[PDB]
Design a binder for this molecule. Structure first.
Ligand SMILES: NS(=O)(=O)c1cc2c(cc1Cl)N[C@H]([C@H]1C[C@H]3C=C[C@@H]1C3)NS2(=O)=O
Ligand SMILES: NS(=O)(=O)c1cc2c(cc1Cl)N[C@H]([C@H]1C[C@H]3C=C[C@@H]1C3)NS2(=O)=O
Lengths: 49, 49, 49
């Protein structure tokens, strides 16, 4: 997730935002705040809380 | 974007989901939920009488 | 759908391909071959046959 006041995305997000990692096939959830920095394909498996 | 739809079209996602969730039905109720035992009446059933 | 042997999209997908329409809010199923001529957003409602 992003840092407060510095927008530092840690975790697997910053690996793709900051040019570290190239692709992420992983259990990652499409949100609203994640489309602005990376891109998702069509979803492949549905779920819920 | 074009590859994930191929997998969804050909059911590869279904096959993988069956492999990694349903072929490893291990614990209890999934396997033993459709069996039958006859009876044996114990005293703990009939005590209020 | 496309016609046999001519690849002529009738229906609504042809209305998007042939410049006649602008957007299609409709009960429309994301298939494979519809991706190659137009663009879809993320799915909003899930179903099955
Ligand atoms: N039954 S499931 O959760 O494992 C599952 C879930 C989905 C699958 C395929 C499967 Cl097997 N493909 C769909 C895609 C197919 C097309 C329609 C939406 C997407 C495009 N996304 S999905 O709805 O996320
Ligand atoms: N339960 S449902 O079919 O009506 C349905 C189905 C979908 C909804 C919302 C609902 Cl209510 N939004 C999802 C999107 C929201 C976010 C999370 C996945 C996608 C992004 N697409 S979806 O999986 O197609």
């Amino acid at each position: 997730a992003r840092d407060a006041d510095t927008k530092i995305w840690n975790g697997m997000v910053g690996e793709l935002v900051y040019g570290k990692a190239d692709i992420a096939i992983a259990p990652l959830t499409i949100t609203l705040v994640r489309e602005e920095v990376i891109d998702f394909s069509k979803p492949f498996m549905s779920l819920g809380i | 974007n074009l590859a994930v739809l191929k997998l969804s079209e050909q059911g590869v996602l279904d096959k993988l989901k069956n492999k990694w969730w349903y072929d490893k039905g291990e614990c209890g109720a999934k396997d033993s939920g459709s069996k039958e035992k006859t009876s044996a009446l114990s005293l703990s059933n009939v005590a209020g009488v």
